[PDB]
Amino acid sequence: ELTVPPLFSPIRQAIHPKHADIDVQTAAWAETFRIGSEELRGKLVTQDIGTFSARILPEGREEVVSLLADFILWLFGVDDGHCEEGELGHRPGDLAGLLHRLIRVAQNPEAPMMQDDPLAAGLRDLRMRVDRFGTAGQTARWVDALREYFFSVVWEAAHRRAGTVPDLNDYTLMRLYDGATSVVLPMLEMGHGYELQPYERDRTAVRAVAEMASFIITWDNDIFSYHKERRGSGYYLNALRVLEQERGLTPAQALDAAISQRDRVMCLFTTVSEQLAEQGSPQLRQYLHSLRCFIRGAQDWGISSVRYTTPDDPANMPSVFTDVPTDDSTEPLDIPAVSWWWDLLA
């Protein structure tokens, strides 16, 4: 059983001043739309999801912070409710059908299908609010991001059904999306009332720093949520388990290897994003700031939420983040799916 040390983060804390109201309003939202079973919802409303959103969009427009918080709770509604603690999470094919239908609800709330499902009803409310604060492009990107997430958790469900653990390369590829990190990105733009143009947003290097944020956020989560996951009775996947199997490591060794990986991605992210900011648009500079807010917001929330601290069986969490890495090198990760990120240096 493990000790998680303070992790390296060069980003300063920030939070929206109305974080408390937002957290209350998200709990009310979960109740209004009856998101999750009574048991699951009871947990979710106590997990400071509004506070989390307030750290992701610390200077964002309040209505969007609220939208993002409701969305993050909805996402746990599907991820906990179906994928990790539901029957559909062992049935990749059935899962795929449900998620395809939910995509259609997100595209067309008016379509007379899944009119009885609470998750669908919640999604319609979210889409309606995306229509207020987003362009057509951002809305489609939000839907495409939902599909990315949905396709990756069907793949995760294949592993859960077979009880298998993917190799590091497959895990990384999967984990870039199955943490529902890319779905947040359009709302970062909406939160500040601008649209990131395709020539920047879809530029290979800008996509890369977005993936780096996803990697750091999911790896930091793997580290912080390890306790909560390992001690649960259900199947679980994370970087530590993958590294134990792949490199024949103990949990403690797997922890250190994981920390070294996210440290190197943290450093790369900072360097490449600074390069991009120097000659990017004002919108790109704001986007890159929001990626920092997302990473650090997930860091502060990860060590504080009862979702990870689990008071009934307390996690051993650090209280602070350090401002220097354990792994200082610019040696690329030995992971084919992401090693190309280091080609972006010059």
Residues that bind Mg ion (CB under 5 A): 79, 84, 221, 225
The amino acid at 128: M
Closest CB to Mg ion among residues 184, 272 = 184
Q: How far is the CB of 153 from Mg ion (least distance, A)?
A: 7
Q: How far is the CB of 143 from Mg ion (least distance, A)?
A: 20
Q: Per the structure block, which two tokens stand in for 154?
A: 């069907």
Q: How far is the CB of 229 from Mg ion (least distance, A)?
A: 6
Q: Rounded to an integer, what distance in angstroms lies between the CA atom of residue 228 and that of residue 314? A: 9
Render 76-127 in DSSP notation, one character per residue.
HHHIIIIIITSGGGG-HHHHHHHHHHHHHHHH-TTSSSS-S-HHHHHHHHHH
For 20-29, give one letter per residue: b (16+ CB within 10 A) or e.
Answer: eebbebbbeb
Closest CB to Mg ion among residues 47, 273 = 47
Instruction: Output the known binding site for Mg(2+).
Output: 79, 84, 221, 225, 229
Closest CB to Mg ion among residues 23, 84 = 84
Give the DSSP letter of residue 317. Answer: -
Closest CB to Mg ion among residues 133, 294 = 294
Q: How far is the CB of 165 from Mg ion (least distance, A)?
A: 15
For 224-254, give one letter per residue: b (16+ CB within 10 A) or e.
Answer: bbbbbbeeeeebbbbbbbbbbbbeebeeeeb
Measuring CA to CA, how many Å separate 166 from each of 101, 136, 213, 236, 262? 27, 37, 22, 12, 19
Instruction: Output the known binding site.
Output: 79, 84, 175, 221, 225, 228-229, 307-308
Closest CB to Mg ion among residues 84, 263 = 84
Closest CB to Mg ion among residues 133, 301 = 301
Q: Which residue is nearest to Mg ion (CB)?
A: 225
Q: How far is the CB of 299 from Mg ion (least distance, A)?
A: 14
Closest CB to Mg ion among residues 55, 192 = 55
How many helices (H) and strands (E) are present in the chain, helices listed first?
16, 0
Q: How far is the CB of 226 from Mg ion (least distance, A)?
A: 8
Query: Residues in the chain, how many?
Result: 346
Q: Taking a C-beta distance cutoff of 8 angstroms, is the pair 92, 154 a contact?
A: yes
Q: Taking a C-beta distance cutoff of 8 angstroms, is the pair 119, 30 a contact?
A: no
Q: Per the structure block, which two tokens stand in for 253?
A: 């060794």
Q: Rounded to an integer, what distance in angstroms lies between the CA atom of residue 237 and that of residue 158? A: 12
Q: How far is the CB of 301 from Mg ion (least distance, A)?
A: 12
